[PDB]
Structure 1
Amino acid sequence: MERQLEAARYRSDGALLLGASSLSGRCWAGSLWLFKDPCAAPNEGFCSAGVQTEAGVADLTWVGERGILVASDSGAVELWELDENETLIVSKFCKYEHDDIVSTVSVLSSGTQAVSGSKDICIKVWDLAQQVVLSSYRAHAAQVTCVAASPHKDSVFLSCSEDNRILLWDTRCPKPASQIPGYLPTSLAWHPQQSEVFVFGDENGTVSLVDTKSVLSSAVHSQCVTGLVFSPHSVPFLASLSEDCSLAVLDSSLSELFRSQAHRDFVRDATWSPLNHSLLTTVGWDHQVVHHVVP
Structure 2
Amino acid sequence: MERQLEAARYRSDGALLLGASSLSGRCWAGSLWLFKDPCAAPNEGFCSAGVQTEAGVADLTWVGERGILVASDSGAVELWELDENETLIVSKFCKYEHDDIVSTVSVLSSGTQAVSGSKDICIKVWDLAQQVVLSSYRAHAAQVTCVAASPHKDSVFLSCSEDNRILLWDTRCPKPASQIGYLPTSLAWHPQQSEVFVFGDENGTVSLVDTKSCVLSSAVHSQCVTGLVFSPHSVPFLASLSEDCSLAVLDSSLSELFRSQAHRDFVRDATWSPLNHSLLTTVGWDHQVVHHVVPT
Whether these two folds match at TM > 0.5 is: yes
- TM-fit CA distance, 1:12: 0.2
Which residue number corresponds to residue 35 of structure 1? Answer: 35
- TM-fit CA distance, 1:213: 1.6
- TM-fit CA distance, 1:234: 1.1
Gaps of 5+ in 1: none
CA distance in 1, matches of 2:94, 2:54: 10
CA deviation vs aligned residue, 1:203-242 (integer Å, no higher than 9, x gap):
0000000000221100000000000000101100000000
Gaps of 5+ in 2: none
CA distance in 1, matches of 2:144, 2:208: 20
CA deviation vs aligned residue, 1:120-167 (integer Å, no higher than 9, x gap):
000000000000000000000000000000000000000000000000
CA distance in 2, matches of 1:219, 1:279: 24
CA distance in 1, matches of 2:138, 2:42: 38
CA distance in 2, matches of 1:128, 1:54: 21
CA distance in 1, matches of 2:271, 2:65: 16
Q: Does 1:59 align with 2:59?
A: yes
Which residue number corresponds to residue 279 of structure 2? Answer: 279
Secondary structure at the counterpart of residue 106 of structure 1: strand
Q: Does 1:150 align with 2:147?
A: no
CA distance in 2, matches of 1:85, 1:234: 33
CA deviation vs aligned residue, 1:12-44 (integer Å, no higher than 9, x gap):
000000000000000000000000000000000
- TM-fit CA distance, 1:109: 0.2
CA distance in 2, matches of 1:234, 1:70: 29
CA distance in 1, matches of 2:258, 2:78: 36
Q: Alignment length, in residue pairs?
A: 294
- TM-fit CA distance, 1:83: 1.1
CA distance in 1, matches of 2:152, 2:237: 19
CA deviation vs aligned residue, 1:163-201 (integer Å, no higher than 9, x gap):
000000000000000000x00000000000000100000
- TM-fit CA distance, 1:9: 0.3
CA distance in 2, matches of 1:245, 1:31: 23
Give the TM-score of the pair, scaled to structure 1: 0.99
Percent same amino acid at aligned positions? 100
CA distance in 1, matches of 2:114, 2:155: 11
CA distance in 2, matches of 1:199, 1:133: 28
Q: How big is the alpha-carbon RMSD for the aligned residues of Structure 1 and Structure 2?
A: 0.3
CA distance in 2, matches of 1:281, 1:20: 15
- TM-fit CA distance, 1:76: 0.2
CA distance in 2, matches of 1:185, 1:75: 23
- TM-fit CA distance, 1:282: 0.2
CA distance in 2, matches of 1:28, 1:99: 18
CA distance in 1, matches of 2:263, 2:136: 38
